[PDB]
Amino acid sequence: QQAVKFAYWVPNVSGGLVVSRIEQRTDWGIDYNRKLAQLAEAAGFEYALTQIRFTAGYGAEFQHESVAFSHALLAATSQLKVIAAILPGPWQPALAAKQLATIDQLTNGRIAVNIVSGWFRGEFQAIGEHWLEHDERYRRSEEFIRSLRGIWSQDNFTFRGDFYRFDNYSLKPKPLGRPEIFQGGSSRAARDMAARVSDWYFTNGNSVEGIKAQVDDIRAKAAANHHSVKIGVNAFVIARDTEEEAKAVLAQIIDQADTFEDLVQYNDGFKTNLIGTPQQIAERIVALKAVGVDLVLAGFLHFQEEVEYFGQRVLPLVRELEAKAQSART
Amino acid sequence: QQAVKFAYWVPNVSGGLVEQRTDWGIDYNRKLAQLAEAAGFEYALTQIRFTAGYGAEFQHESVAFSHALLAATSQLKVIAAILPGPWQPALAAKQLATIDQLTNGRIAVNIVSGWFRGEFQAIGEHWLEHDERYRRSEEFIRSLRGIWSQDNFTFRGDFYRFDNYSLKPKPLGRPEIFQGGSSRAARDMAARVSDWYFTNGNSVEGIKAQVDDIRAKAAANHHSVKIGVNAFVIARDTEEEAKAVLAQIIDQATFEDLVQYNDGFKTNLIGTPQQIAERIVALKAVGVDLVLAGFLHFQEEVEYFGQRVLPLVRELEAKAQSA
Amino acid sequence: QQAVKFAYWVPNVSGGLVVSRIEQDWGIDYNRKLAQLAEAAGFEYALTQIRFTAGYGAEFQHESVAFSHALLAATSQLKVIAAILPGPWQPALAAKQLATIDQLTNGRIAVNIVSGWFRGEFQAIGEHWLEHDERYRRSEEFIRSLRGIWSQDNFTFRGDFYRFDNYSLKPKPLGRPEIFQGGSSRAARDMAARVSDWYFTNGNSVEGIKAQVDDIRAKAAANHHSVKIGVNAFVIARDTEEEAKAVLAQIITFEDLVQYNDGFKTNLIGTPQQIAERIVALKAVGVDLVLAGFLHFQEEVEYFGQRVLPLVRELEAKA
Amino acid sequence: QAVKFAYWVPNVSGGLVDWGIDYNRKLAQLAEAAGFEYALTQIRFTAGEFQHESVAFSHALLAATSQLKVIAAILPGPWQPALAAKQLATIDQLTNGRIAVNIVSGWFRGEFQAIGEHWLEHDERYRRSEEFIRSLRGIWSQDNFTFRGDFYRFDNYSLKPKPLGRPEIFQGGSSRAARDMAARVSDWYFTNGNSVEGIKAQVDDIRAKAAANHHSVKIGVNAFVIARDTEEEAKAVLAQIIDQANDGFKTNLIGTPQQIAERIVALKAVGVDLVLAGFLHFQEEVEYFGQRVLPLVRELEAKA
């Protein structure tokens, strides 16, 4: 029954929304992102989620390294937390645990981690990494996560895994706080891992009924393991003063595609339907809160403008609706 | 470039050496970096460690710490220590490149081949043979140079593979590659792929022999390498006070045994600022281009160095400028 | 083309046909006599199976390479195809061990490269489970390493899975060990069309096999590579057509049986005359070898060489 | 008990710098009739000219004998324990439990470099070998073996069928890492050839280490045996070897059969349980050993 938390996609990779050639006032540079992070902190966003890439993709020509970029965004803010994306394979838990702990010490305990298991083989092939089977990649990520928790929590951590080994490893200093572990993915392997070792699980964008079904499945598995997991939903937010204007922006995205079902195949956040007036979006967010959603991961076309707009128009309405819901229960 | 460059050991790990007014914390090191920049130091060299013990109970991660020190300075260059094994070149190349973009191209790299097998075993890494570790480090260095300067980089090594890898964005500048080690494998690698080579602390005559050997190997490979020397600087107003500080170090740990832990004492940069300045210029005459300085009390002695020892070095360099 | 060659599944793993509870051994004594009977029956190749952990159909398993050496030592002209599984196997050891056995057996050893089907077997032995197409990339580098080691001195190979640096294997094989390979996926038939000498196609009808043969030969021609084709088949040869159809009924639905053993789809069930006619019919669509599986190996293999195989030779003489 | 005897199988060319199968098949049969119990193969991958693969050669030598035991040489690295355990178990079933294993930690980096293997540090190669040995014992003895090592992992691995017997594990090496590993996991330890006084010191050291681990290990010594009818002829062979240019020479098993038999029993008194014999002409001197030297050793044992 706690307040809904909000996070935004850090555009630390170029291209933005690569499937549409619509003009976007978004940049991947540090100066743009420093201002965006400060705007997001002032707007009421709690988390900033970075993206991890090594090779250029179909539309994303430049990518800042996620961990170094997370440290830079943290140094430009005061209370905003930044989720550093980690890709097992090119990343190893020993370095990831120690680097995230140091950054946590330098930023007053405001760093989190998002473990991505990888979807594109070409990124691994370019950097000399082998391409493991789909479920096998999640076995390795689960050992990666358990290593992070053990290294961060024990004086003499020992782990005898199929992918990672530790023998009386002592990390000092440890994180100031307990870095939260975010994780996405929609496959059975992804939600079996989240139901065991993850703090946050990003469920795929869907309708209110579909998201409720995804929430019930993950909580049922988590309860069987006696594990607690909070749930966030990915959403592409188009907030305008009029419903027609917001629906016109969605039309321009499809019209300048490089159908509506094609956007879902690339970005599931459109199915969340956070498109319309600020009052409509706030009502749908609270409706998602009723089915178990604890966090909204927002994507925007013009990040600096729409994040500021979100904090002045949509977020206050969400808080007012939350107080209204809280007052009716008592 | 003709003037002798100066660098200091960043105390990003606890313990110092075998009472010290130094700290491994960020607040102490931010001030120390700013003091070192104003004192005339050009480089800051971090240390890399993974597990607690082996002398250092507390250890900050070198690359992130390098990013923090760079953000607190304007012209200071920071050398990030990298250890092949727990580190892989693809992540190292991309992380250092982004930090280079965020810090106006002021980051360098020091490739360490590792000394404690217990630290490797604790993190699940196998312990390769001595010369084999330098073969892996050399492939690590070649991958960094290739990734940072060309698109579609391809490398088929025994330790690392790359297949048409294009890193974007690339470093703003060209990160210099520093490297130490005194074994034959260490200086054969430096004479091929390294920009800077740290030679062990020794007498003026011994350092000249080490400089002549490394430059001969580099010339045979058609490779250019600059030379720095490690030194533990104890600068006091009187020679007796400096030798008394050295005595307190030995009595709270012999001199020969002290060298086996830190070779910087053999450089003999102990004494008055005039004595130290003369010995620094004498090393410049045998081919030394940089002095890597270690201190007992970093914040105080760095500031003392920039006000007392460094100006005397510049004056002695200008005296020979007329020739 | 040439005379149709025949091969049989070596039952070096227990269980036999696990899909059926019909009474039907994996010991060395049963297999030494089986190899000699197959050699006298006219079989040219013996195909071993590779397994590492107990379960997944076979509770007891003999090591394929050592078992191949034993069958070769008990015969004179029979060729044995040793099954090799990249992962637990490495090309350097495989190349040297098969070369020594080839020297000791007058060049009668071959190799069948298996890409693995059960991830539980790999996980039990500490091996990582690569993606499906990625496993075939490793198997191809495994095959290229064998060919280079067996044929060249100072071999150098810079692969993503295997490396060789100025390696010279001595002694080399007496002959050129043929490389057999199965698999039906796109990656399996792209690898076979490049580096494999023999390709095992899945059991199917005469029309379906012709389509599979044309596709693989078209890919092989594009690579300027020659590949011979064999087909897996479960042969039930009886004196009467009713008796042969009764054995299939006793084993059994039929569609579920094909999912376990695709050799039943080849439909080599019936009288020796019917089977011999279908074998020559398969030869017309490009089949060069028949991989035969049996319920009672010792009895049916000798029966095959006395009843079915002579008819195949007689039918080939007529045409 | 009775002193056991083994001979170096010349399955690699050069001898003491024939290697063919037909030569070694008859030599194995001659050695079995002469009273030798073990045959020790050598493992090589690269020319140093022609080397037979040790395990396949071991299977061939066993098939040519009835009771002779053959020790197959295994090199961790190019060999992995899962394949080694299963292959030796199958050969054990096919040869009436007459297969043994010699775990070699490797001495030449060029052999590993040619086959794509990394060159680990000296003591690190012995740590991997000890995990290799523990994996062999566990796979051969348990229904569901699990091992979480730094070099090898196993998760509920079930080998069926298991070896008919219990394959003995032989191991040499003289470094501290070599005899610390032998004192824990090895059945037999080959000590370097030396004098009777030096061998006793080596035997006492290894048995002291084995007692601390509560482990039992038998001891063999490498020796190059040159047995001739007269002492002068044996000393002439040694001169011809040196003039036309191996720790086994320090054992000093050179001379008449009576002198060698007396020295063998003296080695038995200091803890030696096996003699690893090297010869100049294998097919000839092995037959001579079994007819002239070995019976005298047995006679000296009966008197004791």
DSSP D29-65: HHHHHHT--EEE----SS----B--HHHHHHHHHHT-
CB contact under 8 A, A136 and C126: no
In chain C, residues 84-123 whose CB comes closer than 8 Å to chain D: 88-90, 92-93, 96-97, 99-101, 103-104, 123
Q: Which two tokens stand for residue B194?
A: 């390294």
d(CA C117, CA C129): 10
Q: What are phi and psi of A225, to 5 degrees?
A: -90, 0
Residue A243, both tokens: 């419903």
**Nearest CB partner across the interface for C162, out of D94, D116, D157:** D116
The interaxial angle of helices A278-290 and A208-224, nearest 10 deg, is: 30
d(CA A259, CA B20): 69
Is D64 an 8 Å CB contact of chain C?
A: no
Q: What is the dihedral of CA D51, D56, D57, D60, to 10 degrees?
A: -150
Closest chain C residue to D87 measured between Cα atoms? C63
Query: How far is Cα of residue D185 from the mean position of the Cα atoms in its chain?
Result: 16
For residue C229, report the phi and psi dihedrals to the nearest 5 degrees: -120, 130
As a whole number of angstroms, the distance between CA A139 and CA D153 comes to 15
Q: Give the residue from B161, B162, B163, B165 with the most C CB atoms within 10 Å of its CB, the best one to mutate.
A: B161
Which two structure tokens, joined as six digits, stand for A105? 């010490």
Closest CA relative to residue A140, chosen from A188, A98, A92, A94: A92
User: CA dist A69 to A91, A308, B174, C62, C303, Å?
Assistant: 16, 21, 20, 55, 74
Cα–Cα distance for residue pair D269/D61, rounded to 1 Å: 32
Q: Which residues contact A179 (CB under 8 A, 6 or more apart)?
A: A100, A104, A111, A112, A113, A148, A152
B128 and chain D: CB distance < 8 Å anywhere? yes
Using CA of residue D259, residue D264, residue D265, residue D267, what is the dihedral sign? positive
Tell me which residues of chain A, numbers 263 to 322, contact chain C at a CB-CB cutoff of 8 Å.
none
Cα C242 from Cα A98, distance rounded (Å): 74
Based on C-alpha coordinates, what's the Rg of chain B? 19
Query: D155 contacts in A (CB within 8 Å)?
Result: 162
Residue B55 φ/ψ region, left for φ over 0, alpha for ψ in the -120 to 50 degree band, beta for the rest:
left
DSSP-assigned beta bridge partners for residue B228: B198, B290
Q: Which chains are within 8 Å of C by 3+ CB pairs? A: A, B, D
**Size (chain D), residues:** 304
> Which helix or strand (DSSP H or E) is residue A94 part of?
helix A93-106
Using alpha carbons only, what angle is made at residue A299 by residues A293 and A300, rounded to the nearest 5 degrees? 140
Q: What does residue A226 show for φ and ψ, rounded to 5 degrees?
A: 55, 40
Q: Is the dihedral of CA D223, D229, D232, D236 positive or negative?
A: negative
Contact: A136, C128; criterion CB under 8 Å: yes
Q: Do A308 and A239 meet the contact criterion of CB atoms below 8 Å apart?
A: no
Chain D CB contacts of B139 below 8 Å: none
The three-state (H, E, C) secondary structure of A145-214, written as one string: HHHHHHHHHCCCEEEECCCCEEEEECCCCCCCCCCCEEECCCCHHHHHHHHHHCCEEEECCCCHHHHHHH
Q: What is the C-alpha to C-alpha distance for residues A226 and C239, in angstroms, rounded to an integer? A: 65
C245's enclosing H/E stretch is: helix C241-251
Q: Kindly tell me the burial class for residue A209, based on how many C-beta atoms sit within 10 Å of its own C-beta (0-12, 13-18, 19 or more).
A: exposed
D59 closest CB neighbour out of C66, C90, C164? C66
Asked if C70 contacts C12 with a C-beta cutoff of 8 angstroms, the reply is: no
Question: Is D174 buried (19+), middle (13-18) or exposed (0-12) by CB count in 10 A?
Answer: exposed
List all residues 6 or more positions away from A44 whose beta carbon is below 8 Å from its beta carbon.
A6, A311, A315
Q: Are D65 and D28 in contact (CB under 8 A)?
A: yes
Residue in D43, D79, D94, D144 to test binding to C, most C beta-carbons within 10 Å = D94
Which has the closest alpha carbon to C159: B165, B156, D79? B156
DSSP-derived secondary structure letter, C304: I
Q: How distant, in Å, are the alpha carbons of D152, D201, D218 from that of D209?
A: 26, 13, 13
Q: Is C308 exposed, middle or buried (0-12, 13-18, 19+ CB in 10 A)?
A: buried
Closest-CA residue of B relative to D120 is B128
Size of interface A-B (CB pairs under 8 A): 115
Maximum distance among all alpha carbons in chain B? 61
Q: CB neighbours (10 Å) of residue D209?
A: 18
Contact A131 C128 (CB under 8 A): no
Residue with tokens 């967010």: A285
Cα D223 from chain centroid? 12
Q: Which of A52, A66, A120, A172 has the most B C-beta neighbours within 10 Å, making it the best mutation to test the interface with B?
A: A172
Is B129 within 8 Å of D120 when comparing Cβ atoms?
A: yes
**Alpha-carbon gap: A161 to the closest alpha carbon of chain D (Å):** 7
Chain C partners of A132 at a C-beta cutoff of 8 Å? 128-131, 134
Q: What amino acid occupies position D36?
A: F
Integer Cα distance of B132 and B322 in angstroms: 48
Closest to B264 measured CA to CA, from B17, B23, B47: B17
Sorted by sequence, the CB contacts under 8 Å of residue D55 that are 6+ apart come out as C66, C97, D72, D74, D87, D88, D91
Q: What does D131-154 look like in DSSP terms, one character per residue?
A: HHHHHHHHHHH-SSEEEE-SS-EE
The closest alpha carbon to C232, from C17, C7, C1, belongs to C7
* Mutant choice from A121, A129, A130 vs C, greatest count of C C-beta within 10 A: A130
CA-to-CA distance for B21 and B296, rounded, in angstroms? 7
Confirm if D171 and D190 have CB atoms less than 8 A apart.
yes
Cis peptide before C171 (omega within 30 of 0): yes
Residue matched to tokens 């997001």: A40
Task: Report yes or no: D124 at the B interface, CB cutoff 8 Å.
Answer: yes
CA distance C214 to C228: 12
Q: Which residue of A has its CA nearest to D151?
A: A165
B161 to C165: CB separation less than 8 angstroms, yes or no:
no
End-to-end CA distance of chain D: 11
Q: What is the DSSP string of C37-105?
A: HHHHHT--EEE-----SSBTTBS-B--HHHHHHHHHHT-SS-EEEEEE-BTTB-HHHHHHHHHHHHHHT
Cα four-point dihedral sign A28, A267, A244, A316: negative
The verdict on B129 touching C (C-beta cutoff 8 Å) is: no
**What's the distance, CA C65 to chain centroid?**
14
User: How far is Cα A7 from Cα A44, in angstroms, rounded to an integer?
Assistant: 9
Is C93 close to D79, i.e. CB distance below 8 A?
Answer: yes
Beta bridge partners of A326: none
Contact A134 C130 (CB under 8 A): no
End-to-end CA distance of chain A: 12
Breaks (C-N over 2.5 A) in chain B follow: 18, 253
Among C118, C131, C137, C138, the strongest candidate for a mutation testing the A interface, having the largest count of A CBs within 10 A, is C131
Closest CA to C135 of A122, A118, B159, A131: A131
Q: Would you say C115 and C135 are in contact if contact means Cβ atoms under 8 Å apart? A: yes
D148–chain A Cβ distance below 8 A for any pair:
yes
Do B104 and B171 contact (CB within 8 A), yes or no? Answer: no
> What one-character DSSP code corresponds to residue A296?
E
- Whether D114 contacts C165, CB under 8 Å: yes
Q: Residues D264, D297: contact at Cβ < 8 Å?
A: yes
- Whether residues C130 and A128 touch (CB distance < 8 A) is answered with no
Half-sphere exposure in the Cβ direction for B286 (13 Å, CA):
21
Pair A212, A291: CB distance under 8 Å: yes
A164 shares contact with chain C (CB less than 8 Å): no
DSSP annotation string for A29-53: SHHHHHHHHHHHHHHT--EEE----
Interface membership of D166 toward C (CB under 8 Å): no
Is the Cβ–Cβ distance between B94 and B63 less than 8 Å? no
Degrees (nearest 5) of the Cα angle B196, A127, C113? 130
Whether the Cβ atoms of residue A204 and residue A268 lie closer than 8 Å to each other:
yes
D155 and chain A in contact, CB less than 8 A: yes
Residue D272 CA to residue D22 CA, distance in Å, equals: 32
Q: Which domains does chain A have, with CATH numbers?
A: 5-329 (3.20.20.30)
Closest CB to A132: pick one of C131, C160, C161.
Answer: C131
Block residue for tokens 């996070």: A7
Partner D contacted by A160 (CB < 8 A) = yes
- Residue the block writes with tokens 């060990």: C177
Asked if C157 contacts C181 with a C-beta cutoff of 8 angstroms, the reply is no
The tokens of B238 are what?
A: 């009187």
Burial zone of D266 (CB within 10 Å; 0-12 exposed, 13-18 middle, 19+ buried): middle
Contact D55, C97 (CB under 8 A): yes
Find out whether D267 and D221 touch, Cβ atoms under 8 Å. yes
Report how far residue D141's alpha carbon sits from residue D135's, in angstroms, rounded to the nearest whole number.
Answer: 10
3-state helix vs strand vs coil in chain A, percent to 5: 45, 20, 35
- The position carrying tokens 């002579």 is C310
Question: Which two three-digit tokens encode residue C258?
Answer: 């094909």
Q: Which of A115, A49, A110, A121 is nearest to A86 (CA)?
A: A115
Pairing of strands A111-115, A181-183: parallel
CB B17 within 8 A of CB B262: yes
| CA atoms of A191 and A201, how far apart (whole Å) | 8
Q: How many CB atoms lie within 10 A of CB B19?
A: 7
Q: Are the CB atoms for B177 and B111 separated by under 8 Å?
A: yes
Q: Which among D45, D63, D157 has CB closest to C125?
A: D157
Q: CB distance A173–B58 less than 8 Å? A: yes
| Contacts of B among chains (3+ CB pairs under 8 A) | A, C, D
Helix, strand, coil content of chain C in percent (nearest 5): 45, 20, 35
Amino acid at A227: H
Nearest CB among A128, A133, A162 relative to C131 is that of: A133
Nearest CA to C9 out of C43, C57, C33 is that of C43
As a whole number of angstroms, the distance between CA A163 and CA A146 comes to 12
Contact C165 B156 (CB under 8 A): no
DSSP H or E run through A6: strand A5-9
**Neighbors of chain D by Cβ distance (3+ pairs < 8 Å):** A, B, C
Partners of residue A52 on adjacent β-strands: none
Instruction: Answer for the pair A191, A213: CB distance below 8 angstroms, yes or no.
Output: no
Peptide bond just before A90 cis, omega within 30 deg: no
Residues 6+ apart with CB under 8 A from B220: B191
Taking the C-alpha atoms of residue C113 and residue C142, their distance in angstroms, rounded to an integer, is 9
Residue of chain C whose alpha carbon sits nearest to that of A136: C129
Three-state SS annotation for chain B: CCCCEEEEECCCECCCCCCCCCCCCHHHHHHHHHHHHHHCCCEEECCCCCCCECCECCECCHHHHHHHHHHCCCCCEEEEEECECCECHHHHHHHHHHHHHHCCCCEEEEECCCCCHHHHHHCCCCCECHHHHHHHHHHHHHHHHHHHHCCCEEEECCCCEEEEECCCCCCCCCCCEEECCCCHHHHHHHHHHCCEEEECCCCHHHHHHHHHHHHHHHHHCCCCCEEEEEEECEECCCHHHHHHHHHHHHCCCCHHHHHHHCHHHHHCCEECHHHHHHHHHHHHHCCCCEEEEECCCHHHHHHHHHHHHHHHHHHHHHHCCCC
Main-chain phi, psi angles of C4, to 5 degrees: -70, 125
The tokens describing A222, both together, are 């988590």
Q: Are C104 and C80 in contact (CB under 8 A)?
A: no
Task: Enumerate residues 6+ apart whose C-beta is below 8 A from D297.
Answer: D3, D261, D264, D265
Give contacts of B165 with chain A, Cβ < 8 Å. 54-55, 126-127
Q: Contact at 8 Å (CB) between B191 and B217?
A: yes
Cβ atoms of B279 and B269 closer than 8 Å = yes
Q: How far apart, in Å, are the Cα atoms of C160 and each of A125, B88, C114?
A: 9, 16, 19
Give the end-to-end CA distance of chain B in Å, rounded to a whole number: 17
In angstroms, the CA C242 to CA B172 distance is: 82
Instruction: Please tell me the distance from the alpha carbon of residue A125 to that of residue A132, in angstroms, as a whole number.
Output: 11
Measure the CA–CA gap between A77 and C185, rounded to whole angstroms.
Answer: 53
- In chain B, residues with a C-beta closer than 8 Å to the C-beta of C158 are 156
Q: How far apart are the first and last CA of chain C?
A: 11
Query: How far is residue B120 CA from its own chain's centroid?
Result: 21
Q: Which of D126, D124, D100, D105 is nearest to D181 (CA)?
A: D126
Could you give the CA distance from residue C292 to residue C275 in angstroms, rounded to a whole number? Answer: 12
Given CA atoms D284, D285, D289, D291 in this order, what sign does their dihedral have?
A: positive
Q: Three-state DSSP class for C300?
A: helix
Which residues are B6's β-sheet partners?
Answer: B291
